């Protein structure tokens, strides 16, 4: 902690970090034990910097306890954090000071113009008085050759006054048009002081996000940010909580170029794109889908980026050319990392005799300052040694629930309502162009006022430019309004398909977490997309159906069926029911008219952890000790509060207890104020079976699936596998077909028979 504090104190010395009005909180969160008791603003900032680094250690520890993959936290992470904190602080102060100077000049120019029109209106009155004097003098002289010249001079003044009064009206319109701009710029100038105070806190959070939260997923990224934010609140360090980190670390123009480079429209993807720009250590990209790899190539296409791999024999030649010529390089298969990159990643360069030399292998290469390298991998499950983790910054392109919901909502919209999807896609493009035009017009309006020397009214072209920029802004603003209302009608169409997208995200994340129960249950995002594509388009049920509501219900029903059929074909039969139960829960959460059943399912899964005393559990006649203990545990639920009385009062309970199939005739032993739904009855019977006859729990579980997903939901798994249909249609040539078999079974013999039937040489 002392080492971290000293490094932060030394590096942030050049930073301002000075706040004479800073108030020390009563409970100062102290991380450095030797921190002065009355700390200053700078010492509080460095203390927060040390705290941020340590929270990554506990975050890794928490992930380790949950069996989660972790990356080593090294002092190079701390160095990157303070490097980013210094760079962001200087950039934010420079931009906001420049913005304040621009606004003050623009406000000053308007105020001077307001003074100019006041005096120029006064000049108009004097000129009118001069015209009256000249006209009266000319009339008096005429009423008594030279008089023709006198009236000619008066006519010239009349034209000059006409130009002046035309300048009065035209300028007054310009000030009226610029009234809104003056009001907005004045408000921003008032908020300038507020923005100054929060630079230190905002930059600390932004720098920590780039340096640390790259590898973690969305939930952990939010957890780290909140923990950092709370510490700053307890330390009385000002920071803004209204702006998003994606908007604070990047501008709108850069974000538009990112989506043009095939970057997915997501907050996590935007954060990952920010890290790929402001990185200090060379990034290591983790994207199983490969979309980040395409985004990197598109972003650096103009700079002649090259794709290579560690396995390629030409990697050394490609790396040498990139270092020598300063070209961007993208290296894949980083799980086979070549230690030849160690000096390059560590930036160990020698500046001798005017040459920047990098020692690659046994050769010294002139390193160009424009060189940049990106490491990529398609395996999210890969381990990395601690030295590699210190040399690179991780940029994990995980899939979030919100991102998948948007993808599935767009996919069903394109399949079901192609006219709405193309109308929506065009509207997004139009709004993106309109907002870009507004920024250019606002920037041009501000830049034009600053560059004028003298006054606006002195030169006519400035008045023309200001009016043209304002009228174009109004036309674009009206276009923005009209696209929004057309956007609103598009949303109403997509609201109907919204529940389907939620089910798709829930289904896939169930598949993703299926790896916890068995190592073999590895499913990629593309596997789910093939299921979704097959349901949406290759749906026999949607053969001649024309109603949109009927087609949506068919798609929702077939989405669960096809997902089970494909996944369970590569699962052990003992795990088939487990996947079906969770699929039923997903359908239950999206069913209209069904209670949450959270309490019932809570006791179904963790009902055995209830603490029971020896004297608390009575001895009910006809029930075994473990059976009696289950009844007491089941008695905690309100619906089973009087379960013991009902069991004792039932003389036929002994017949049901030893019955061959008790799950089919479960007695009504629960009390409800209203008639429960058939699903609700199944859950209560499921709880009763678990308490009394645990051997029949699996049989009752299948009945529960039949209540939700239908009787024939799992019936397809009892038929022999149809390899002809799946291989011919549902299997792409690029996708290998895995014959996984339990010991004692060999699936190759099916393959020759399958090939023989199709007359395909193998």
Number of neighbours of residue 265 by Cβ within 10 angstroms: 14
Distance of alpha carbon 461 from alpha carbon 441, whole angstroms: 17
Alpha-carbon distance of 347 to 282, in angstroms, equals 10
Residues 689 and 663: beta-carbon distance below 8 Å: yes
> 730: burial class by Cβ within 10 Å (0-12, 13-18, 19+)?
middle
DSSP run (H or E) holding 357: strand 355-360
Q: How many CB atoms lie within 10 A of CB 201?
A: 22
Of 270, 231, 230, 266, nearest in space to 249 by CA: 270
Positive/negative CA dihedral, 565, 571, 574, 580: negative
Resolution at which this structure was determined, Å: 2.8
Contacts of 219 (CB under 8 A, 6+ apart): none
* Long-range contacts of 554-561, Cβ-Cβ distance < 8 Å, separation of 24 or more: 555/412, 555/416, 555/500, 556/499, 556/500, 556/503, 559/500, 559/503, 559/504, 559/507, 559/531, 559/532, 559/535, 560/503, 560/507, 560/586, 560/587, 560/709, 560/713, 561/709, 561/713
If you write DSSP's letter for every residue of 394-435 in order, what string do you get?
EEE-PPPHHHHHHHHHHHHHHHH-HHHHHHHHHHHHHHHHHH
**DSSP designation for 730:** I
| Residue pair 150/141 in contact by the 8 Å Cβ criterion | yes
Structure token pair of residue 7: 């490094």
CB atoms inside a 10 Å sphere around CB 558: 20
CA distance 700 to 562: 23
Q: Are the C-beta atoms of 574 and 498 separated by less than 8 Å?
A: no
- The answer to whether the CB of 518 falls within 8 A of the CB of 537 is no
d(CA 526, CA 499): 21
Tokens representing residue 620 in the block:
């009910």
Nearest to 86 by CA among 199, 246, 244: 199
- From CA 697, how far away is CA 720, in angstroms rounded? 26
DSSP 237: -
Closest among 255, 250, 266 to 397, alpha carbons compared: 266
Q: What distance in Å separates the CA atoms of residue 363 and residue 346, rounded to the nearest whole number? A: 17
| Residue 697: both structure tokens together | 């729990």
Other C-beta atoms lying within 10 Å of the C-beta of residue 615: 6
- Identify the CA nearest to 435 among candidates 395, 481, 466: 481
Among the listed residues 178, 272, 734, the one whose alpha carbon sits nearest the alpha carbon of residue 469? 178
DSSP assignment of 691-706: HH-GGGHHHHHHHHHH
Q: To which residue do tokens 């919901």 refer?
A: 405
Cα–Cα dist 300/694, whole Å: 61
Tokens in use for 566? 């494909």
Strand partners, 306: 329
What are the CA-CA distances from residue 66 to residues 62, 69, 249 (Å)?
A: 7, 9, 32
Residue with tokens 């980026």: 305
In what helix (H) or strand (E) does residue 308 lie, and over which residues does it extend?
strand 306-309
- CA distance linking residue 442 with residue 145, whole number of Å: 57
If you search the block for the tokens 């009064």, which residue do you land on? 165
CA atoms within 13 A on the CB side of 724: 9
| Cα atoms in the 13 Å half-sphere on the side-chain side of 679 | 19
At a CB cut-off of 8 Å and minimum separation 6, what does 693 contact?
657, 662, 663
Q: d(Cα 398, Cα 285) in Å, to the nearest integer?
A: 11
- SS3 category, 249: coil
Q: How far is CA 523 from the centre of its chain?
A: 22
Structural tokens at position 561: 């069926």
Q: Is the dihedral of CA 191, 192, 198, 199 positive or negative?
A: positive
What pairing do the DSSP bridges indicate for beta strands 393-396 and 349-352?
unpaired
Strand 355-360 and strand 393-396: pairing?
Answer: unpaired
**Residue showing tokens 């073999």:** 520
Contacts of 514 (CB under 8 A, 6+ apart): 521, 523, 567, 571, 579
Nearest C-alpha neighbor of 89 from the set 196, 11, 200: 200
Using a 10 angstrom Cβ sphere, with 0-12 exposed, 13-18 middle and 19 or more buried, the burial of residue 179 is exposed
E strand or H helix at 115, and its extent? helix 75-143
SS3 of 506, please?
helix
């Amino acid at each position: 902690t002392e080492a971290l504090y000293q490094v932060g104190k030394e590096f942030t010395s050049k930073m301002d970090l000075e706040k004479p009005n800073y108030i020390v909180p009563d409970y100062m969160p102290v991380v450095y034990d030797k921190l002065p008791q009355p700390p200053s603003h700078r010492e509080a900032i460095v203390n927060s910097c040390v705290f941020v680094h340590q929270t990554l250690h506990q975050a890794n520890a928490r992930l380790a306890k949950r069996g989660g993959r972790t990356m080593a936290i090294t002092p190079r992470h701390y160095l990157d954090f303070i490097n980013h904190y210094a760079n962001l602080f200087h950039e934010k102060r420079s931009e906001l000071e420049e913005q304040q100077m621009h606004l003050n000049v623009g406000l000053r120019k308007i105020k001077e113009t307001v003074d100019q029109v006041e005096e120029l209106r006064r000049d108009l009155r004097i000129k009118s008085q001069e015209l009256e004097v000249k006209n009266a003098a000319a009339n008096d002289k005429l009423k008594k050759e030279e008089y023709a010249v006198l009236i000619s001079e008066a006519q010239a003044i009349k034209a000059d006054l006409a130009a002046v009064e035309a300048k009065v009206n035209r300028s007054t319109a310009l000030l009226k048009s610029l009234s809104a701009e003056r009001e907005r710029w004045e408000k921003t100038s008032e908020t300038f002081k507020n923005q100054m105070s929060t630079i230190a806190g905002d930059c600390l959070l932004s720098a920590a996000f780039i340096a640390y939260a790259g590898y973690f997923d969305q939930q952990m990224r939010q957890n780290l940010f909140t923990t950092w934010s709370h510490h700053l609140q307890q330390a009385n360090i000002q920071f803004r909580t209204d702006i998003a980190r994606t908007e604070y670390l990047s501008n709108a123009d850069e974000r538009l170029r990112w989506q043009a480079s095939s970057l997915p429209a997501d907050d996590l993807c935007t954060e990952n794109a920010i890290m790929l720009k402001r990185f200090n250590r060379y990034p290591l990209i983790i994207d199983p889908s490969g979309q980040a790899t395409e985004f990197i190539m598109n972003e650096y296409k103009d700079r002649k980026i090259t794709r290579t791999s560690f396995l390629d024999d030409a990697f050394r030649k490609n790396l040498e050319s990139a270092l020598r010529f300063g070209n961007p390089l993208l290296v894949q298969d980083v799980e086979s990392y070549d230690p030849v990159l160690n000096p390059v990643l560590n930036r160990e360069v020698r500046r001798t005799g005017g040459r920047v030399l990098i020692t690659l292998g046994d050769q010294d290469i002139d390193l160009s300052p424009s060189f940049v390298i990106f490491l990529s991998t398609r395996d999210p499950t890969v381990e990395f040694p601690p030295d590699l983790c210190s040399r690179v910054t991780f940029v994990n392109f995980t899939v979030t629930r919100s991102s998948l919901q948007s993808q599935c909502l767009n996919e069903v919209l394109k399949a079901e309502r192609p006219d709405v999807d193309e109308k929506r896609s065009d509207l997004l493009k139009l709004q993106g162009e309109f907002q870009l035009r507004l920024r250019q017009l606002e920037k041009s309006l501000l830049q034009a006022l600053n560059e004028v020397k003298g006054r606006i009214l002195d030169d006519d072209t400035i008045i023309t430019t200001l009016e043209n920029l304002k009228r174009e802004a109004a036309e674009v603003t009206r276009k923005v309004e009209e696209t929004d209302i057309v956007m609103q009608e598009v949303e109403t169409v997509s609201q109907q398909y919204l529940p389907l997208s939620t089910a798709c995200s829930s289904i896939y994340f169930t598949m993703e977490s299926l790896k916890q129960i068995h190592f073999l249950y590895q499913y990629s995002l593309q596997f789910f997309l093939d299921i979704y594509h097959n349901v949406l388009y290759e749906n026999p049920n949607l053969k001649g159906v024309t109603d949109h509501t009927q087609r949506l219900s068919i798609i929702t029903k077939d989405l669960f069926q096809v997902a089970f059929n494909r996944v369970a074909r590569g699962m052990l039969h003992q795990d088939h029911i487990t996947f079906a139960m969770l699929l039923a829960r997903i359908k239950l959460k999206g069913t209209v008219g069904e209670p949450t059943y959270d309490a019932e399912f809570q006791h179904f899964l963790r009902g055995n952890e209830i603490v029971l005393s020896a004297g608390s559990t009575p001895r009910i006649q006809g029930l075994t000790v473990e059976q009696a203990e289950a009844v007491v545990r089941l008695s905690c639920l309100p619906a089973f509060k009087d379960l013991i009385a009902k069991v004792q009062a039932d003389e036929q309970f002994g017949i049901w207890l030893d019955s061959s199939s008790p799950e089919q005739t479960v007695p009504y032993l629960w009390s409800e104020e209203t008639p429960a739904t058939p699903i609700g009855q199944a859950i209560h019977r499921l709880l009763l079976i678990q308490a009394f006859r645990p051997d029949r729990l699996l049989a009752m579980a299948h009945m529960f699936v039949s209540t939700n997903l239908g009787e024939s939901f799992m019936s397809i798994m009892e038929q022999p596998l149809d390899l002809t249909h799946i291989v011919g249609t549902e299997v792409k040539p690029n996708t290998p077909v895995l014959m996984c078999s339990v010991p004692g079974y060999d699936a190759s013999g099916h393959v020759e028979d399958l090939a023989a039937e199709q007359n395909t040489q193998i």
